[PDB]
UniProtKB/TrEMBL annotation, chains A, C:
Protein name from the UniProt record: Putative Rhs-family protein
Species classification: Bacteria, Pseudomonadati, Pseudomonadota, Gammaproteobacteria, Vibrionales
Organism: Vibrio parahaemolyticus serotype O3:K6 (strain RIMD 2210633)
Keywords, comma-separated and alphabetical: Repeat
Record domain DUF6531: where: 4-62
Domain Teneurin-like YD-shell: 121-298, 525-667, 669-938
Full-sequence range covered: 149 to 1131 of 1381
Signal peptide: none
Length: 964, 75, 964
């Protein structure tokens, strides 16, 4: 249904809806056309309505004309009844949670209950015309006619301004809208009160042609301005067909009532719908061998929705209210509780949590409390505006300016937010003050003649946009000076991504509107094949092939990732509701054993076991580890980790202390004390380690300018207009860099063909057809790497060293076979938890919910780290208080270790330092610390950045864990 | 069979009753009486008196598997 | 198995288990026979054990012993793992939570744990003979030998006394037991070491016979002494058949493994069990058209028990524990949690309740907290004896007389108890005391030469019992002097009920041993025909039928009762597990609507609607009544009703208070204070109304003797040996009554035919063949009443009046079409919630837990009652303080209203006074106030009372709510 925008597919009816003004409180002023039966006039022209007139005939006979156009009727579900004989109160109570209270002797209606917190109050004049509209208790809209029965002006009854000024003529039809934003759209009708051309405020016109006669005429050949939205319609009996401007004809077959029965695609897909001669669907047949069967009870309610080769939902309804019971296909059950007038009450979640609600006298949610923290509170004023809102202890304070817009936000830290507007909406400026006289992080916006953002201002730079009277953003100008253009083909689909350098990015689409093949910058190709259901079944790369598969459940089952050789042989087995727990391949296997209450209890990674327990509320406590080791977690108010105890009696408990804004501030166990302080904007400026001191001085462009470390350290940084590192000033070891403002070095000794460097610091690189470098010739050391079908390293050689890296079904490294020995890894999700190098298990404990390392347990002892704001470890100390491990990263992370008693392979963010290749590995790719970028491309083509090899703009304020 | 010893606990419960009928026989007459003993099921009353109940004294008595709570279904 | 003797039915082996010492601590010493392979001698005779022998042939090769004689099993669920090769620790750990620890090189049995609180400890000698058997930590049994390897003396290891005397002879066999109770039984063996005659201590003799030779014979022809249990067994290989002394031949069909596959009853009932050759059932067939399908999983555990045309239970375990989840067919979840050392932890109840347990360092429960009160705390001393126990704040203290028996219980009010034992157990006397020097409610028991009771000395009288050497209650003698005998036929079934008046009750049993046919005292007769499952389908009364009919689910859904005319046509809609939510009839239709958890929030009776809301813990608050009325409930600690507020601003809230014992003591709302005082035994003696006083003085037989009301009242009563009313004098009007010790008048004015009166003070009654009276001729007055097939009055006429009583599908009164007007009643399940007499909706509020009326709300006003110790309203006042309604009752209760300002139809207990009939209607019957008895027989033939028309013994301290 509704193929074209102003087109209905049930018949030749032309339906066009438009919203004139949209109030922020929730008020909407819509108007429809209803070309069918356009021989009537309601005052707003022939075939028009204001969505606020609902006339009725007699007490409750017929009529009840809706904006579009007991006494219980099942086919529609209406309860229009009679409450008292004195004044007529019909109270339609339609099935779509609506209610209209019409009154007699005045010819009007009120109490338009669309939801729970939505109402409408009408006030009419002595005639059949409405004059005032109030949302809940106060008037919000006021009418103004021309003493002839036509709406000419609509005010807000607060300030005398024009909102919607209609323009009529001698033909009794509006020829203008003049909405709140200020856009004017023209209209032209034929001699039979039928619109023939709709003019947009930008200039794009839509032509309309009619081939029928009378009032039941049809609408065909609804094209656009320059042949962009051409649509051909055909009606053969009860069958309909519609085609766009790309030779894509869709067919629909309906019944005599108006319900959908058959829908076909010009590619082969076809859906089927069956009914029960009462207006309710019984069988839904997909273009595959899967069918859905519905099962109703008394008064319908859609009890069961059984899917083929699967489970059911088993919806449970207690009364005419909303749903109160839900059964998950896996077996999880949840309930609810409603009163006799709404205002939902405590309801249990899926596994074990409850949420208690509490409302005020007016009926608004004032308290929403969860078990053991997570309690949100609201505080309203006498009016219907929000004043205070708390989620975890923030308690923000909103300030108003006697209007419907907020112009002030107060935080419990000293800094405040101030918003600046204009006559209309579309907020203009936002500023962030503080407790002292200063201004930082001020944003500025600007709009063109239309209602579109023309430029965005930032303390870093300004970004401009160019529009083509179609709201498509076909040109983006960057602060540096470069620009990116866009090429839109028919039906407004992006095709080219040509930049200001010459290299472009071409796109392709099939006869279904799906992306099929994207030409890369270097000239790559793809196919992106799909099945008759809509999922991807064959990647079909120019060199490799994946050929995904499913198990008639919508989940991945088997992968055939291989370019003829080196078969990966991945395989998974999902249940009816996910939870595969069978991550098995030819190299490793991972299984997960759950509890009876839907909680994870065991994670067997091939041969090791971890085990974890949960509490009654649902938090994870007492996480056991192998080799006779167990941890104990203890939370506090608001549900945050606050105590970590060890099984050994000679290990002190670690304690954390957060600030008011909910950020880790103090960390101490027995003698180590990490202290972090913020300035209010959310950036670290000072750090203390109970014996050390680190300070950071920023510049005017919100970037780290100077770093002062108390252990004889003072460094400075100077960047370019974009943010790339240009100069680093040490105590006399000064270095300089240069880039082409796109992520590639532009020095006098570099060479880039399309997007990859070919020479840097006297080192040559040789890439393959895929895109990753395979050969590296340095200063007398030739290296050759081999990649698998999934763009992953399998073996490197050439430097008199041969090692092997074993992966798993997910893609994480777990086994290292080098010349030294065998190294085993034990991960926890997507983070490294423990290591084994045949000399004792070494476990790592990080921050509560970040990747910054905190401590390491090994050799029956504990060692603490000293990481900076980036998250890279530079100092490792023991419980006694002496220096055990020290390092220093100069510009990119190359270690200069001078004292090392215990090996610390930790790096910037979840990276392991290799002693043979000197490369980092986050989760999928290999970063080169001596170069400054990755050695291979990421699976994301264009949705992750312009440069496929860039790691970050500057590695001082940017992180990129988990690979891509 | 019923060839078991009847202790004082098994006699003090039948002595304070008004049926004057053994349990294996009393459980059959009350079984074939569902024409009037049927009541509103699914809800627990607040009168602490069921339909098959009847004559009861007014003197309050507080005479003294046992620590846990019985689950609905158990095999 | 266990037909007449514990001998098994699968094979011919004779099995019998006898107990020797039954201590209150929980120590059981049972000995079995095990006729099969009884050629071994374990120290007690050929085939005699003591359930304490658990030897092992080797170290750990699936070997264990018992009176009833890793490597995880699948058929038995046993898993005995090795712990130490030095000293063997087998840890059998059988499937039924058993535990046995065998010791190697010493042959000792340690750690016999049959659960969580049941332990066992043994202590042997230098040889393989045990001498000490302690339960947990205290020596409770010490055994001795006779220098031949046979136990002859068993004491308690605490005080020198003989408890068990095993007497042997010169044939290596035991002939005497001499248990702690003093009952010695003789035995007799054959030449092949097989028992053939067992003499009971009472005098009964069981003669055993065998058919085969050796140690694999078939025990057949096991008859009693006087042909009591003439059992006949017949084997045909895998099939067996057993017949009783009344021609009841059951046939069992076993297999080569020893399972159950068919059980045919002599009537024709058949059962079919199906296996899957794995040791677990899969299909269970019933005699009707229904079947249950089991579904196991890994390690069995019976994960599903799905019944045909119904739902499942869906059990659940975590890894090895017990039931932690149960999905009832209704749809409510109740989880649980267990740790690794038992000690049950928090568990959620059905709706919202949770229970938290807390234990001490030992394995005993200490605290058990629940939601909104309901907290019990225990106190344990250094020993394993309970000291103090608190359930709701009473803190009942216990006292022990330096033994394992309780010698006193102390109450918080001041009441002190004292128990009096003897050398054996079987407590002899129990007495109560108080803070003052007095005594009250002292009992006294007595035993004969055997271990059975002989007489009970009650403060009311002395009851006697006479047995027939079989413990079958042959004769019972009342304190008055009358006696009731009991006659038993074969198989020990009650047949006759001859009383001391000539009449007799008869019983009849069919081939299934079910009661089918009862002969009343007057000469009634019944059939009681059951179906093939065990439910009555046709009552077949002498003049009426019921014709029950189920819905193949065990629930009743249709009652088509009729005696030729006046069809009832009842119907029900019971769902899977109750919750009918529908009761339709020809007069009224009741409907109910439950929530998602199981809360009853709808009581729509006909055209009216009642509602109630529930809290998060199941408490009911804010009950909304029809006619725009809503209350409010407020609870306090320990879960009790504390405050009852109203919605109107002109209605004050009512408050109550409780005492230390947990009973209502005082209650007041704004100016009306009621206070009750108790003596300690649990009887009201003093009642104050803040302006009125009532005192009660009892006699020496625990009966109300004198009542003193401050409004010039001093009434006296004197009963007889049985408690019937004999003399009563309010002020000076002495009345005289006399009964025949069976609830029938004995004065010279009546004439009883069989058990019912025919005349009383000139008035003559006329009874029909059913048993209820239809005509009553008084002083020129005739009242003819007609009844339906459900023994209910529908129309009583004669006194120039016609009345129509329209009931519901349950049996309550709904409509009363009389000459005055139309009165409608609305109930609350059992109580009367409100009424409407075409003038106003008047509601009633009773006590929170009893049927005593408290207040009545009508016309926006409240009127409070003044009830005595019985619970009958005698005075009704208003909020101001002036008396509004007053009445009086002399011996039975009669309308003696002196001031009538508001209609007060309330009566003794849930009764309703009729104005056109002058009778009372409690729930389903009609009581005559000026007669003393009812007008019809109760539905319970004999299990309800000795007389079918008697209301109570004396209408002073006896109530009878709910009709019967």
């Amino acid at each position: 249904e509704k193929a074209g925008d102003p087109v209905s597919l049930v018949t030749g009816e032309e339906i066009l809806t438009l919203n004139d003004v949209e109030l922020p409180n929730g008020f909407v002023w819509s108007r429809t056309y209803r070309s069918s039966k356009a021989s009537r006039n309601q005052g707003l022209g022939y075939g028009w309505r204001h969505a606020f007139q609902f006339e009725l005939k007699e007490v409750t006979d017929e009529k009840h004309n809706v904006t579009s156009w007991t006494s219980y009727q099942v086919y529609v579900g209406a309860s229009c009844h009679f409450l008292n004989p004195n004044i007529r109160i019909v109270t339609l109570s339609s099935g779509d949670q609506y209610r209209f209270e019409l009154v007699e002797d005045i010819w009007l209606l009120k109490q338009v209950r669309n939801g729970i917190f939505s109402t409408f109050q009408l006030r009419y004049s002595r005639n059949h015309r409405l004059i005032e509209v109030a949302h809940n208790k106060r008037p919000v809209l006021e009418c103004q006619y021309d003493k002839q029965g036509r709406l000419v002006e609509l005010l807000n009854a607060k300030t005398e301004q024009v909102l919607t000024t209609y323009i009529y003529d001698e033909q009794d039809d509006l020829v203008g809208a003049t909405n709140d934003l200020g856009l004017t759209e023209r209209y032209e009708y034929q001699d039979q009160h039928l619109i023939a051309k709709r003019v947009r405020p930008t200039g794009f016109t839509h032509y309309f042609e009619w081939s029928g006669e009378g009032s039941s005429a049809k609408c065909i050949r609804n094209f656009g301005d320059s042949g962009i939205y051409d649509y051909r319609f055909h009606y053969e009996g009860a069958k309909s067909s519609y085609s766009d401007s790309l030779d894509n004809e869709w067919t629909f077959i309906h019944d005599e009532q108006g319900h959908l029965l058959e829908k076909s695609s010009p590619t082969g897909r076809t859906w089927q719908w069956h009914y029960d001669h009462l207006g309710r669907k019984e069988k839904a047949v997909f273009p595959d061998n899967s069918t859905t069967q519905y099962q109703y009870n008394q008064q319908g309610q859609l009890i069961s929705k059984l899917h083929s080769s699967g489970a059911q939902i088993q919806y449970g309804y207690d009364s005419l209210g909303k749903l109160v019971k839900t059964v998950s296909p896996d077996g999880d059950l949840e309930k609810a509780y409603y009163n006799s007038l709404g205002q939902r009450v405590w309801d249990i979640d899926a596994l074990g949590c409850v949420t208690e609600y509490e409302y005020d006298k007016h009926g608004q949610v004032v308290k929403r409390e969860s078990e053991d923290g997570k309690k949100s509170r609201w505080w309203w004023d006498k009016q219907q505006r929000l004043v205070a809102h708390e989620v975890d202890g923030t308690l923000l304070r909103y300030s108003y300016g006697a209007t419907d817009l907020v112009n002030g936000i107060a935080y419990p830290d000293g800094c405040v937010a101030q918003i600046s507007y204009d006559d209309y909406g579309r907020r203009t400026s936002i500023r962030y003050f503080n407790d002292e006289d200063k201004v930082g992080y001020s944003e500025e916006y600007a709009y063109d003649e239309f209602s579109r953002v023309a430029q965005i201002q930032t303390p870093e730079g300004v970004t401009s946009y160019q529009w083509g009277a179609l709201a498509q953003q076909e040109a983006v100008i960057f602060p540096d000076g470069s620009h990116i253009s866009y090429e839109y083909d028919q039906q407004r689909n992006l095709t080219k991504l040509v930049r200001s350098d010459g290299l472009a990015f071409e796109f392709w689409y099939d006869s279904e509107g799906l992306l099929s093949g994207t030409v890369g910058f270097d000239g790559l190709h793809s196919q992106f094949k799909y099945d008759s259901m809509g999922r991807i079944i064959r990647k079909d790369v120019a060199d490799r092939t994946v050929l995904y598969s499913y198990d008639d459940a919508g989940f991945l089952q088997h992968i055939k990732a291989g370019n003829g050789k080196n078969i990966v042989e991945n395989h998974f087995n999902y249940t009816l509701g996910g939870r595969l727990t069978l991550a098995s391949n030819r190299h490793q296997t991972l299984q997960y054993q759950y509890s009876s209450f839907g909680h994870l209890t065991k994670r067997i990674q091939g041969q090791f076991e971890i085990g974890e327990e949960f509490n009654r509320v649902g938090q994870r406590v007492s996480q056991t580890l192998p080799d006779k080791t167990s941890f104990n977690f203890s939370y506090d108010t608001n549900g945050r980790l606050s105590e970590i105890r060890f099984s050994d009696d000679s290990l002190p408990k670690i304690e954390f202390q957060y600030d008011v804004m909910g950020r880790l501030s103090v960390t101490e166990t027995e003698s180590f004390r990490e202290s972090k302080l913020y300035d209010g904007v959310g950036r670290l400026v000072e750090q203390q380690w109970s014996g050390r001191e680190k300070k950071y001085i920023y510049n005017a462009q919100n970037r780290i300018s100077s770093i002062l470390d108390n252990t004889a350290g003072a460094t400075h940084y100077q960047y370019d207009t974009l943010g790339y590192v240009t100069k680093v000033s040490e105590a006399g070891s000064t270095s300089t860099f240069e880039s082409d403002s796109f992520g590639n070095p532009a020095l006098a000794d570099s060479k880039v063909m399309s997007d990859r460097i070919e020479a840097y610091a006297g080192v040559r690189y040789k890439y393959d057809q895929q895109g990753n470098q395979v050969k590296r010739e340095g200063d007398g050391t030739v290296q050759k790497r081999v990649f698998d079908a999934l763009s992953q390293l399998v073996e490197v050689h050439g430097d008199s060293s041969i090692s092997h890296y074993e992966y798993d079904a997910l893609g994480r490294r777990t086994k290292k076979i080098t010349q030294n020995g065998i190294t085993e890894f034990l991960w926890e999700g997507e983070r490294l938890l423990g290591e084994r190098t045949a000399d004792g298990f070494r476990w790592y404990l990080y921050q509560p919910e970040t990747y910054i390392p905190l401590a390491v347990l090994e050799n029956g002892s504990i060692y603490l780290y000293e990481c900076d704001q980036v998250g890279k470890p530079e100092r490792l100390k023991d419980s006694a208080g002496n220096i055990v491990w020290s390092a220093s990263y100069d510009v990119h992370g190359f270690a200069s270790i001078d004292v090392e008693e215990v090996r610390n392979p930790l790096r910037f963010q979840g990276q392991y330092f290799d002693q043979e290749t000197n490369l980092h590995y986050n989760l999928a790719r290999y970063y080169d610390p001596k170069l400054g970028r990755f050695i291979q491309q990421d699976p994301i083509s264009i949705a992750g950045g312009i440069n496929h090899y860039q790691y970050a703009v500057n590695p001082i304020q940017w992180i990129d864990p988990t690979g891509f | 069979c019923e060839e078991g010893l009847k202790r004082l606990q098994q006699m003090l419960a039948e002595y304070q009753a008004q049926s004057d009928v053994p349990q294996e026989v009393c459980d059959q007459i009350l079984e074939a009486a569902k024409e009037s003993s049927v009541g509103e099921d699914g809800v627990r009353s607040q009168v602490k008196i069921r339909k098959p109940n009847g004559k009861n004294n007014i003197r309050y008595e507080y005479d003294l598997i046992t620590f846990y709570r019985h689950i609905n279904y158990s095999d």
